[PDB]
Amino acid sequence: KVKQDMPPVGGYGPIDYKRNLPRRGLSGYSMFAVGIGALLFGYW
Amino acid sequence: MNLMLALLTNFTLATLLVIIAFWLPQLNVYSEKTSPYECGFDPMGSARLPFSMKFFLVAITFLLFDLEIALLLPLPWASQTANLNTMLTMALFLIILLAVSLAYEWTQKGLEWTE
Amino acid sequence: MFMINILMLIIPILLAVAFLTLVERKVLGYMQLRKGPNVVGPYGLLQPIADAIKLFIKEPLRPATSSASMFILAPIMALGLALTMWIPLPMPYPLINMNLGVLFMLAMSSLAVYSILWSGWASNSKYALIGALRAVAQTISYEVTLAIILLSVLLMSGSFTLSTLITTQEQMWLILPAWPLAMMWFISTLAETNRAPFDLTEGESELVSGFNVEYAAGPFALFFMAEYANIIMMNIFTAILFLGTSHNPHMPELYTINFTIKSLLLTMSFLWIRASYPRFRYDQLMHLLWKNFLPLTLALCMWHVSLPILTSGIPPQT
Amino acid sequence: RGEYVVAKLDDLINWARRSSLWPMTFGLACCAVEMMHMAAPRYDMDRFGVVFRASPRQSDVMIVAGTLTNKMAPALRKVYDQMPEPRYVVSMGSCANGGGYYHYSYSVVRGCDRIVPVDIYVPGCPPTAEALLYGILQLQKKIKREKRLRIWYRR
Amino acid sequence: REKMFEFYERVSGARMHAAYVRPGGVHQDLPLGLMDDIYEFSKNFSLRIDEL
Amino acid sequence: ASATRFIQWLRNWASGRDLQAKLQLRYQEISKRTQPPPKLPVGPSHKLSNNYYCTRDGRREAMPPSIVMSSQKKAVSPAPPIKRWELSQDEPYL
Amino acid sequence: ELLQVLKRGLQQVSGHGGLRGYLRVLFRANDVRVGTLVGEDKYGNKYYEDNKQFFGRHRWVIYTTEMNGKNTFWDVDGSMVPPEWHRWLHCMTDDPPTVKPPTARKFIWTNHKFNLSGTPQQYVPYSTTRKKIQEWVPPSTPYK
Amino acid sequence: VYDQVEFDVPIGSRGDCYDRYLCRVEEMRQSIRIISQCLNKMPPGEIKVDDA
Amino acid sequence: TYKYVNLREPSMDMKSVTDRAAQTLLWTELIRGLGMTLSYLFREPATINYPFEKGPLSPRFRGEHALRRYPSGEERCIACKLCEAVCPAQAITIEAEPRADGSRRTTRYDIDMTKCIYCGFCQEACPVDAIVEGPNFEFSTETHEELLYNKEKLLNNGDKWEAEIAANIQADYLYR
Amino acid sequence: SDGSSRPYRCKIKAPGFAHLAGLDKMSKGHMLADVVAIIGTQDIVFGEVDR
Numbered sequence A: 001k002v003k004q005d006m007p008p009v010g011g012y013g014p015i016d017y018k019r020n021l022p023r024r025g026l027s028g029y030s031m032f033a034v035g036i037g038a039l040l041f042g043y044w
Numbered sequence B: 001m002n003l004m005l006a007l008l009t010n011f012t013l014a015t016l017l018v019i020i021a022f023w024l025p026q027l028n029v030y031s032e033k034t035s036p037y038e039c040g041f042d043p044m045g046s047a048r049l050p051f052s053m054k055f056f057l058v059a060i061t062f063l064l065f066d067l068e069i070a071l072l073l074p075l076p077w078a079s080q081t082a083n084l085n086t087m088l089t090m091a092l093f094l095i096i097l098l099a100v101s102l103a104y105e106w107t108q109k110g111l112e113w114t115e
Numbered sequence C: 001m002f003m004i005n006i007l008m009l010i011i012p013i014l015l016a017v018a019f020l021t022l023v024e025r026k027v028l029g030y031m032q033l034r035k036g037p038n039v040v041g042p043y044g045l046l047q048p049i050a051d052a053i054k055l056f057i058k059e060p061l062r063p064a065t066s067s068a069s070m071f072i073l074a075p076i077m078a079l080g081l082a083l084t085m086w087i088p089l090p091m092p093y094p095l096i097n098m099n100l101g102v103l104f105m106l107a108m109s110s111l112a113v114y115s116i117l118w119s120g121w122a123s124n125s126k127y128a129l130i131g132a133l134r135a136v137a138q139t140i141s142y143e144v145t146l147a148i149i150l151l152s153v154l155l156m157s158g159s160f161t162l163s164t165l166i167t168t169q170e171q172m173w174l175i176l177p178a179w180p181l182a183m184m185w186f187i188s189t190l191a192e193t194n195r196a197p198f199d200l201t202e203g204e205s206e207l208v209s210g211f212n213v214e215y216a217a218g219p220f221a222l223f224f225m226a227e228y229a230n231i232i233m234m235n236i237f238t239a240i241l242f243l244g245t246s247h248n249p250h251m252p253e254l255y256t257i258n259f260t261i262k263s264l265l266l267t268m269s270f271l272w273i274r275a276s277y278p279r280f281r282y283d284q285l286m287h288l289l290w291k292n293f294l295p296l297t298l299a300l301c302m303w304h305v306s307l308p309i310l311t312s313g314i315p316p317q318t
Numbered sequence D: 001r002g003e004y005v006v007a008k009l010d011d012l013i014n015w016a017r018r019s020s021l022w023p024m025t026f027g028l029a030c031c032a033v034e035m036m037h038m039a040a041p042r043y044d045m046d047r048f049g050v051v052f053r054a055s056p057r058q059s060d061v062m063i064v065a066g067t068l069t070n071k072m073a074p075a076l077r078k079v080y081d082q083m084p085e086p087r088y089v090v091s092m093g094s095c096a097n098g099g100g101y102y103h104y105s106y107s108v109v110r111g112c113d114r115i116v117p118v119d120i121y122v123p124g125c126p127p128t129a130e131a132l133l134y135g136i137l138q139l140q141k142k143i144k145r146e147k148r149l150r151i152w153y154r155r
Numbered sequence E: 001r002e003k004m005f006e007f008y009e010r011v012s013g014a015r016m017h018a019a020y021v022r023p024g025g026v027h028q029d030l031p032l033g034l035m036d037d038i039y040e041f042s043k044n045f046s047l048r049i050d051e052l
Numbered sequence F: 001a002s003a004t005r006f007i008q009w010l011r012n013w014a015s016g017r018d019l020q021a022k023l024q025l026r027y028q029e030i031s032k033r034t035q036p037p038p039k040l041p042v043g044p045s046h047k048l049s050n051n052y053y054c055t056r057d058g059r060r061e062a063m064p065p066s067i068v069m070s071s072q073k074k075a076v077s078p079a080p081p082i083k084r085w086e087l088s089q090d091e092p093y094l
Numbered sequence G: 001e002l003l004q005v006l007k008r009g010l011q012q013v014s015g016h017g018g019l020r021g022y023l024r025v026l027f028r029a030n031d032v033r034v035g036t037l038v039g040e041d042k043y044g045n046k047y048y049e050d051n052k053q054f055f056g057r058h059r060w061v062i063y064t065t066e067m068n069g070k071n072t073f074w075d076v077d078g079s080m081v082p083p084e085w086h087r088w089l090h091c092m093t094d095d096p097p098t099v100k101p102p103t104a105r106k107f108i109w110t111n112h113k114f115n116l117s118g119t120p121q122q123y124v125p126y127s128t129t130r131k132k133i134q135e136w137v138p139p140s141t142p143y144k
Numbered sequence H: 001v002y003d004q005v006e007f008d009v010p011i012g013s014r015g016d017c018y019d020r021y022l023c024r025v026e027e028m029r030q031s032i033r034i035i036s037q038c039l040n041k042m043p044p045g046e047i048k049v050d051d052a
Numbered sequence I: 001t002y003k004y005v006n007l008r009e010p011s012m013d014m015k016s017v018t019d020r021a022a023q024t025l026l027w028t029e030l031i032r033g034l035g036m037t038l039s040y041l042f043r044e045p046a047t048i049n050y051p052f053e054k055g056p057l058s059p060r061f062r063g064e065h066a067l068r069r070y071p072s073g074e075e076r077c078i079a080c081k082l083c084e085a086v087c088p089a090q091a092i093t094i095e096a097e098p099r100a101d102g103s104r105r106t107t108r109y110d111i112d113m114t115k116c117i118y119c120g121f122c123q124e125a126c127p128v129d130a131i132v133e134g135p136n137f138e139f140s141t142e143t144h145e146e147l148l149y150n151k152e153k154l155l156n157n158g159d160k161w162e163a164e165i166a167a168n169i170q171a172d173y174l175y176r
Numbered sequence J: 001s002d003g004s005s006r007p008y009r010c011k012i013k014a015p016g017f018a019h020l021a022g023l024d025k026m027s028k029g030h031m032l033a034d035v036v037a038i039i040g041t042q043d044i045v046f047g048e049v050d051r
Ligand SMILES: CCCCCCCCCCCCCCCCCC(=O)OC[C@H](COP(=O)(O)OCCN)OC(=O)CCCCCCCCCCCCCCCCC
Pocket: A035, A036, A039, C180, C182, C183, C184, C186, C187, C197, C238, C242, C273, C277, C288, C292, C293, C296, C303, I024, I025, I026, I027, I030, I031
């Protein structure tokens, strides 16, 4: 019987390609509030 | 004397290292070696030719703004005055006027480089 | 006994600089999924020595068109002034205690620019000239902002003495009340030291080597040594300014340990930043400083003048 | 003994020179891609102390990586001449070695050794990045064999 | 890219100048187990693009 | 593959990805370097009959160019206008 | 897990026959990993593998300190690997010559040789053909 | 056999370097998309024209 | 089908405008880029320890040339000159004549390794597997002349590398 | 082709040849460091440009 390089019986598993940049981090309100809170503690 | 000794030592050591660098290695001088570098081809014209300055206006402004910091540096000492009403007004007056000139130069396109 | 103290300053600086080059190569290597120097000595520990010896037995070249005196003067001045930036640094005691130590550093930093200007001009070469004029532009970009930032911070310290910054930060790091200034300061020191993403006077991918394209062997090494000595010095300056270490007079070595760790970590971030970003275009550097930092630095200078007065927290003059 | 001292001093300078080889950022054609692969993470030439630098003034080695044409020949000689000494040349690939597959071309220099002296010849079209790395290590061992101060002593 | 030269070398014996595609088809057939390796390479590459 | 748990968490957190599932260094998932021998198929011309080369000779079917005009009604274009492309349903906007 | 890491590091000193052998490999090969010995060739090279290392680092050779009368304690190069182990080391095969020995021929070199360039026993090219035109030889006696 | 694989052509809007950078990056993802189809659709048979 | 790489309209609600304000002032997208190079610092690097470790190759690798023999020790080459005819670089030079016995054998067989493009057409063209490209790629020399191989050098290469060469042909000849 | 086993003429059309010819057009009004970016965006390899 012929034996040459072929893909598996049901094909290969799924391959990702779409862009994926996960969304991370806090909101603008939260980050500004932390910074202003740090300033006020420092001033005091 | 401490400071002058420190300055003399710093630059002496630097000079000594240059002297070693020039007198210790084997030299082989010829015309092609010491010719000016320009990526393998001979330079077109002299490197002393005029080089246009596109930020000429910002450079002149730097002069006027650099003198402001000389006027603002004494502020930590000025905060020790009893007459705090006057200093705070005049301290803020100077900075605001410095900000006004920046706003004027910005809006009039002085910060953009010429073409 | 003072000359011995001077030598216990210069010699470690040069050795610290030499092994900073190894650390930079390794850190960039691992951040780039490679190893970096690991053959010359164990873990590449002897790589700096090989580079130093190699460079000083390499033939130095005086270009045929160069101005000989300024060509030789410029590298001497670069290293000489680099070592002079360390003499007022309190670690925790300075070699030279100066009333206006902060101002002394501004003067010496401004004078160190001319080592770029005169080396580039004296070379009499077009890539060296372009690199030199980028130094003019880059100095025009940052110094005005850089001195005003120091002024805002010193309005809380109360003097230009560097050792007073230690006393000011006995209860707390100044980075809390002045983190907006710390950010703009940190970026300024990158431009001040000609470091990526502001590595424009040498600008390798655009100007081949910029202001020092014609320098070889020992003279080249001096510029390299000066450049890396200023990386460390300006990160030490940042640690003193914003991350003050507590000083116990009877155990000063504890200060020097904690102080050294902070300065090392700040120095690592320069390598970390170099591995992470592309390069500014040198006109974009000017507009960064003049249109973003300067408007905010001017506003914050007003704020830090008023704030001690309105909160009744003016620092002592002494 | 002077003989012992100069023998040791050669070891010192030879070790420094072979341990800190800085090739000129210089590549001509296909073979420059394999040179880029030698700098890449798998081989990481930098781990040997081999650092690319653009300026000829700050370079120790010229790797001639690709075809040298007649139009490019003066430029290659110019940047070689502008290297401070000691300087070495590595000829990489068939084109630089002896003209290769454009050997009979009217516009091609039949080997870069017509223009510069060559220390190591690396065969291949292109040599694998590992073949080039073998060539660089062969240059290091050549430098390790230099007897400059021993020969000076016996002059 | 180094991993992709390995695919070149495994079908042609040369990392770069394969001379593999010729008028009439290709020079040699895929070696056994090569498509499995290409699939392993492909399954992770999109993550590398994201890092870029 | 040998990184400790803490370093795995640190570098996973720093990159925002799960790096361990898509490691860029290859391990045991790749093919063996010794493979069983192939037995490759033969092409369609491997026949013992009904296989005269003159009936499958591509080169000898190539003809010299057809002369349309030699220097010895509705207008036309070289081909119909190209149909307009459609937006991807996969992801029209990156 | 940090202590476990340090114990692996300490086990490498013992795995290399003490600190002297550990320093020997660290300075010769700039690596101190301990692998499974696969075999040794007649020139003294030692071949190791570790299949938990990523592909490329899972096999390696520790070159002999002496080969063919040449001191190779510090001077080693890839051309010291004999052909039988060359195939295994470059992953052209899975089987070492210990398990799958090569086919023996009378004409195959019994003693492998490394790169001889730059030595008195380097290769020197020459034409392998004989003279093509024979020149007439005048008579050895006078007659004129 | 390019008429047998599905892929999208990236298109820029501003005609500058940044849009061409994005086009090339997205083209790499489409190449991975095509490669995935080539592995699954690879047919058997010979590899050069059976015409000696 | 096509897709747009850069055709976005950004949100103008207060939350989205403040999220961009925080990004501009707090350099959030620049910090995100530091995290990615930090994550590589703690990855195991891809460097191998050459020359103690070697890059993987396959049986098809095209390296240094060699002239092979039959098991009896007779040369395989019959001076047919097919390798010389196909050589894209004209790197092979051959002369031949009847040996002292009646055999058809070469008297000259040169390969200019600085003309060769290591393409492998010669071993494809050879009808008797006489000329092969072997697995050796570590034969850089100090002189140009050392790369102009005559018949003695190539026969020595075959005698030197036959053990590996025969095994590589054994792995690949059913693909040929 | 002229009917024989050796091509009569083979003109190679390299995309980078046209693209590089347009470098002067694309660089109008830009600075030195932008020309570095513009060269890269064209994706030039001089093997095909020069042949
Ligand atoms: C209660 C009253 C209180 C009053 C005070 C309250 C005020 C608090 C909030 C004020 C704002 C805080 C931030 C101010 C810092 C300066 C921010 C800034 O200017 O960044 C914007 C700048 C411009 O970039 P761009 O977005 O292109 O242009 C904008 C439109 N033209 O973009 C940049 O600067 C980017 C710089 C690029 C180079 C960065 C390379 C390094 C990045 C990592 C650094 C990490 C920082 C670590 C700092 C160390 C601290 C020692």
